[PDB]
Write a protein that binds this ligand. Structure first.
Ligand SMILES: O=C(O)C[C@H](Nc1ncnc2c1ncn2[C@@H]1O[C@H](COP(=O)(O)O)[C@@H](O)[C@H]1O)C(=O)O
Ligand SMILES: O=C(O)C[C@H](Nc1ncnc2c1ncn2[C@@H]1O[C@H](COP(=O)(O)O)[C@@H](O)[C@H]1O)C(=O)O
Ligand SMILES: Nc1ncnc2c1ncn2[C@@H]1O[C@H](COP(=O)(O)O)[C@@H](O)[C@H]1O
Ligand SMILES: Nc1ncnc2c1ncn2[C@@H]1O[C@H](COP(=O)(O)O)[C@@H](O)[C@H]1O
Ligand SMILES: O=C(O)/C=C/C(=O)O
Ligand SMILES: O=C(O)/C=C/C(=O)O
Ligand SMILES: [Cl-]
Ligand SMILES: [Cl-]
Ligand SMILES: [Cl-]
Ligand SMILES: [Cl-]
Ligand SMILES: [Cl-]
Ligand SMILES: [Cl-]
Ligand SMILES: [Cl-]
Lengths: 461, 457, 462, 461
């Protein structure tokens, strides 16, 4: 009824995950509406350029763009075993006056391929502000936490202190590259236009009695009507399936970024340092994003393979595949960005869990700070280094062998050797003094790189 | 209605491609009904093993296996953000008596993982007879055409003659390897059974007051009820997702086979030697098979990646992915097998086209046999080789430079140097003499390898 | 030099990673020596079946199996742009008496494909005992640690306790499935044998003057000489490239398993519960490397899938360059991973006092039901007790997250006279060995029923 | 040997396929010379910026950039189990005065990552002119063959005529999209620069005693010394591995293009319409087969960096290292080989016009029937009636072809039928192949003038 009977398989991307907006863009109502819209634009342009098409035929066509008899369309397709021709017949039935001029000069891909290009670009236009919003919410988080010291991890082992906001900027930088990629692909998408069966426009040239200029005009007119700046000069029957690679490749790369970000979030949730928005709390949304982002990456192999084995001016082995992977890649991407937005709005941070971890690990990373202090006081770097080695091993043994807390500072405190440095210990181990340039980097990044990127999307934040 | 509104995305695998039977196996009806079947079996087993579950509670559960309020379950899941708990609640709603004991001792995966294993095996069982049927129909074609000479192709260039039937056996053999793969994975599939939250059955042990024999018997009892010969001993929360790799990998390899087979048919269609069953005729069914087969191959990277990053006793980042890739792999495989059967039932061959192509190419492959005939006629191999070489270059130029028919045999016939073999030319150029052991290979293959494999189906 | 001068690219798989044994299996010496071995076996069988081949011709070839002039071969291949014909000519140069009968009746794939099948089987035979050894070492660890309680993880969040040994069985099981896979593919690998240019044996049938029996005998005999139980009946020019899918698919699956296992170890290394074999701060670098290589193993499966899908008719040569890369690389990658995993599995470091601490911080939240059950057994209510134990768990969780302190939930219960009926039981109720379920029982049954039978064939090489 | 002894595995990419120039770029000599060049630049800039480095330390480091003791470095790496530190120690041993300031403040990635970025960019600079050269050769072919009619193929079945040159433009267009992608990735490549252990420059900030300006100057000074216009602001330990996805994705899409082009060439070769250049009746399209084989590996390799980036934890994990040693080099050596081979193919492509012409003659009559019907309607005949008469003749001709294995005799059937007497005198004209190719010829001209030549202009050299 809505997403269908439960007695048959229903894609989870439709019934469970994707927004109504993205679902509609990949719906048959939208597909077949656009087929008629393209047929109308064709008749309109053809009428202007002199072909015998009456205003009645245009008005009739224009008044039935939504008037789609799916039952009739289905029966015709069972009969003809051809989907475009099924719809040509069905459109001509409710438009009896224009029936004879519908699809005039065109091959099936005039509606099929141009609709897919309109769908791709409209789908890209849906993703962009959703991605932009996720980036803005994280940028707010990053700026807010820019100076909050946190344990750094390499090999997922204790490393030089970063900040929560600086770490957030690694996430933001990858998503920003995705925003630029998606925009580039949307902006550079070209219209197939009117090209004919094998790309030569032979049909249209005959209809215009050899007038090459009128053929070029028609192609320009339908392109403009479709809202595209530019059409291919060169096609076979179809737009080059290299286009489908370009689109799904940028979505795949977005998948990898989201999977990385959400893996980091899941690890922070184990560490109790950060948690998804409101005893056992599971980072289920981040896990979902990983799950769906993995499918995005997997799907890139479909268009790669498809384009690689397209023979000459077209083989029809692209069709069933594209029905699946194009829609599912955008429905998957839509779901991910909707969820990441929801995650990024109220990430819970626990400063005192973060501080406890730093206090347990920083003493082992601060030994050169201690030597420097003792040497400046007039001690020996060689004598000091030995003393710290032993006390550090003692502390390490407590942590590993006994499961105790790190007591290195306490050992240094009660050892008389470090007499000239006892009053400095609190300053020397101040975690903010160990975070390098993290806060200055966050500011400069957001200002120079992030905010300029977001400016176009302020309207819808 | 049945597939839903055209105002929303609908999977073409559902609305366009897969059979009703496969669509039902991956339907929410079948799934949640099976969830309830597993709860019934559990309560039955747990009752036999002494837990406080009454007969009338079990009657209540059995009477309601199909009575599923999908609207309520969706209301609960919106509220609980937990799918299995929503169905526990909803089953407990229409079963007020048994409500207290549904899911007793189980974790979510008890219904979720076991249902997937039941579904995977049922799906495999739907595929197997269809694949056997394709093989059977192709075997019929291979037998009928076992001796029909046809131009061999290597580098897709003219090569040593094969037969139509022998070439078909290349196709059959790959599909036989798939049939064996699918049957193995089906037969080796193990039930998760009752394992508790992290795989230790700590819940059931406590319910049975430390009695291990009862905990093992429960696992055995529910496994048997589900009709599985064997259950896992070792699990985390889930069955190992390596299982999903094993299943989709064999599906991926089936895809590769069908893509190659259908690519060959498409090329033969261009050559006008073969056509799909009944001016332009397009091998559309073969093209669609290729299209879908490619998706089957692509899908293997999903379970590979999933398994690689499951942490400890399980992470929930397998869940959304599996909802998509498992169903799709099987619905795609189903479609391909349904279409491949259609293709295999009336393949059209054009012997006269096949013959004409052999006549254009065989003379170039027949020159060593002409030379052999001259040598034994009291002649020189080196002289003949040079004479035959110039005429073969002459004929090759007519073909490529003049777009003409190959006239090499006519050139040989009129050149008096070949007087010692002129009377043998009809014999020397008989295409059936050039196919080597192709028909005998077909006979032995079908007899020894194919027919024994089909005998159970 | 051994791996060439540093002024050109050199594969890390050869210069850095794989064992010498696996490198040699994928060497040109081994390849081209096997070409010659195959030529000798063909001449042997042909002579037996009556073709005009002499004992001295066979003696000559046998004497020169290893006497490969690589420079001459390269020179000839530059002239002929054909690798097999280059080696036919080179072999005939050093075997002048045999030159005329080398490769008699055969197409190039007689040496190319059959050598690849010999290599694949030999390569699997190198991997098998290495995996068996990894499984056995982990099985020893699993038995040793079968009762050692450890915090369970689902969502990587605290869950019902498992044991260190039981968790190891999750890893072992996957590798046992791989071991079975590799053995199956190895055992079921069929020989191409002698098949001719398009698979019809037309050349051989003519040589034997139409005697079908003799062609069938030839194929049997060379298959037997190469040590294979079974040859294909049906081929085009090549063995079906579906074979390459079957082999690299099992390697890909092994890759996923090792990636999972080594990710778990790296996570245990962060938690300080387990470390790699022998400093305070240590990196799981070997596990990281195994993950890095395992990923390449999974990636490589798409090569033979694609290759097989677009082979036209009796074969196209677009498989050749690809197979030179992916078959060797997959095995060199797999070999390295198993060499490293063996090393990781020997002396895995465990820290029971870190494990215990973590358990004590998390168990009380998972033990509330037991503390309630004990009150109801004493005489208290379950509705009343569940509420009072709720609020204490709330404050303890807040101490952990808001204060950043230790879990004081058991102290809150201890210092509260409502839980007076059960105060003396608290240690018994919180005994972590009482929460591990059937973990240790499962380890024993698994090892005895599933693991040890698999390992028994490999006992002499352990 | 020079590729090593035949007793061990040797990559066919080095031993067999790639050019010596691309082999050199991914060689250890080039890698470790660049490590030392980077150490020289770090010291140079550090000296200028006031750190205690002498001129004879710099004179020493500069004079030993090529004097690499690989044996010593290998010994050191076995001992340290650390490749970078082995080379710090080895470089310090031949530069004993400078030993104590080599790598000052830096982490291993300073040399590791920056060298990889230098190599990636130099690798892309080798490919670019090669791809431009292929496009240029193909454009000459397209121009020469712009108007030559050839049978169109859709479903790989006879379709509306195109031209040899127009079909070549489908190939050219995909390669032009690749040239733009590679150029884009190359230009947008950012330097990692000096970032420290976890990306915070804490080491350098200390060395400059809190002077942030000097840390920023150092990052700019080395970035500029390396010939890069821009450095990252935000890194962890490493440059984001999304960079590797971006680079191998464009190579993967290039593989798809080449696989399609070479598949078409292989099909044309079967049809005897086109052949690879002469280096002879049975000829195999072996170069094109090889290109398809390698292209496939290029497409396969994209899943490596996708997976790598998706599971990088925090400021980095070392599970990327081994994978990248394989896939980055292999992708570029594979790409290099394809382009070398494709240029070779494109240089003397052979066309057989009489074969092409014969195929057209066999197939065109069946596509000419609508045009014959139109000429009869113009002469006074009924469309419906004429369609029926011509349909029987057409079905008779198709049966001669398929059932008798004969030549298409449809035109002869029409010529001797008195029914078609009104158009008999027009048949020669109605069946002219050039008249069926539509705008194919003008499309080649416009495409080459507007979209190809401007892209090639910069590469003139
Ligand atoms: O415009 C034409 O019809 C000309 C034809 N090109 C085609 N162009 C577009 N669609 C075509 C084409 N051919 C078939 N079909 C129809 O597409 C449908 C494919 O079904 P599916 O494989 O399920 O996606 C399915 O309905 C097919 O009938 C050509 O010969 O070049
Ligand atoms: O036995 C034959 O030669 C018959 C031929 N089949 C072939 N079988 C095996 N190898 C062949 C074949 N053809 C070429 N080549 C040679 O393979 C080599 C391919 O080189 P690469 O692409 O670099 O791997 C390269 O050396 C090629 O020359 C056929 O026409 O069916
Ligand atoms: N450990 C678990 N086992 C089974 N299901 C779970 C678990 N944790 C959460 N879930 C639920 O499983 C579903 C996952 O949804 P999805 O990510 O869309 O597959 C959600 O309803 C979760 O609440
Ligand atoms: N954080 C790091 N950055 C760079 N290199 C490292 C780091 N940690 C270890 N290494 C070294 O990098 C090399 C990784 O080797 P492989 O995994 O074979 O590429 C080894 O020599 C490691 O010791
Ligand atoms: O909800 C469950 O069934 C399991 C949850 C978990 O393991 O965290
Ligand atoms: O050895 C290094 O350069 C870095 C090591 C680390 O980050 O752990
Ligand atoms: Cl059109
Ligand atoms: Cl359970
Ligand atoms: Cl069709
Ligand atoms: Cl052979
Ligand atoms: Cl390390
Ligand atoms: Cl640095
Ligand atoms: Cl060749």
């Amino acid at each position: 009824g809505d997403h269908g009977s439960p007695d048959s398989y229903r894609s989870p991307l439709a019934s469970r995950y994707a927004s109504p907006e993205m679902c509609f863009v990949f719906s048959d109502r939208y597909k077949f509406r656009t087929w008629r819209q393209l047929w109308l634009w064709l008749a309109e342009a053809e009428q202007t350029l002199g072909l015998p098409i009456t205003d009645e035929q245009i008005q009739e066509m224009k008044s039935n763009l939504e008037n789609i008899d799916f039952k009739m369309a289905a029966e015709e397709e069972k009969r003809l075993r051809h989907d475009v021709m099924a719809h040509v017949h069905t459109f001509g039935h409710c438009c009896p006056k224009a029936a004879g001029i519908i699809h005039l000069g065109a091959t099936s891909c005039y509606v099929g391929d141009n609709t897919d290009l309109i769908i791709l670009r409209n789908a890209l236009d849906l993703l962009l502000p959703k991605l932009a919003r996720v980036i803005s919410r994280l940028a707010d988080f990053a700026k807010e936490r820019a100076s909050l010291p946190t344990l750094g991890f390499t090999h997922f082992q204790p490393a030089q202190l970063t900040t929560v906001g600086k770490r957030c900027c690694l996430w933001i930088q990858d998503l920003c590259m995705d925003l630029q990629n998606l925009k580039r692909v949307r902006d550079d998408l070209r219209f197939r236009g009117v090209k004919g069966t094998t790309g030569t426009q032979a049909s249209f040239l005959q209809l215009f009695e050899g007038d090459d200029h009128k053929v070029e005009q028609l192609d320009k007119m339908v392109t403009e009507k479709a809202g595209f700046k530019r059409a291919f000069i060169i096609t076979g029957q179809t737009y080059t399936r290299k286009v489908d690679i370009e689109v799904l490749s940028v979505l795949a790369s977005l998948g990898a970024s989201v999977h990385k970000i959400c893996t980091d979030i899941r690890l922070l949730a184990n560490l109790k340092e950060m948690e998804e928005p409101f005893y056992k709390r599971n980072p289920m949304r981040s896990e979902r994003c990983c799950s769906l982002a993995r499918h995005l990456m997997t799907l890139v192999m479909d268009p790669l393979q498809t384009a690689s084995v397209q023979w000459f001016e077209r083989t029809l082995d692209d069709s069933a595949n594209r029905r699946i992977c194009l829609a599912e890649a955008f429905l998957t991407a839509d779901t991910i960005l909707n969820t990441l937005q929801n995650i990024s709005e109220g990430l819970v941070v626990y400063p005192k869990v973060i501080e406890r971890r730093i206090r347990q690990e920083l003493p082992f990373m601060a030994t050169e700070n201690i030597i420097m202090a003792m040497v400046k006081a007039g001690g020996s770097r060689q004598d000091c280094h030995e003393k710290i080695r032993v006390l550090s091993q003692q502390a390490a043994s407590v942590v590993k062998q006994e499961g105790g807390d790190n007591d290195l500072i306490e050992r240094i405190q009660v050892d008389a050797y470090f007499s000239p440095i006892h009053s400095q210990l609190d300053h020397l181990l101040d975690p903010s003094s160990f975070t390098g340039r993290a806060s200055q980097q966050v500011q400069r990044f957001l200002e120079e790189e992030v905010y300029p990127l977001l400016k176009p999307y302020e309207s819808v934040m």
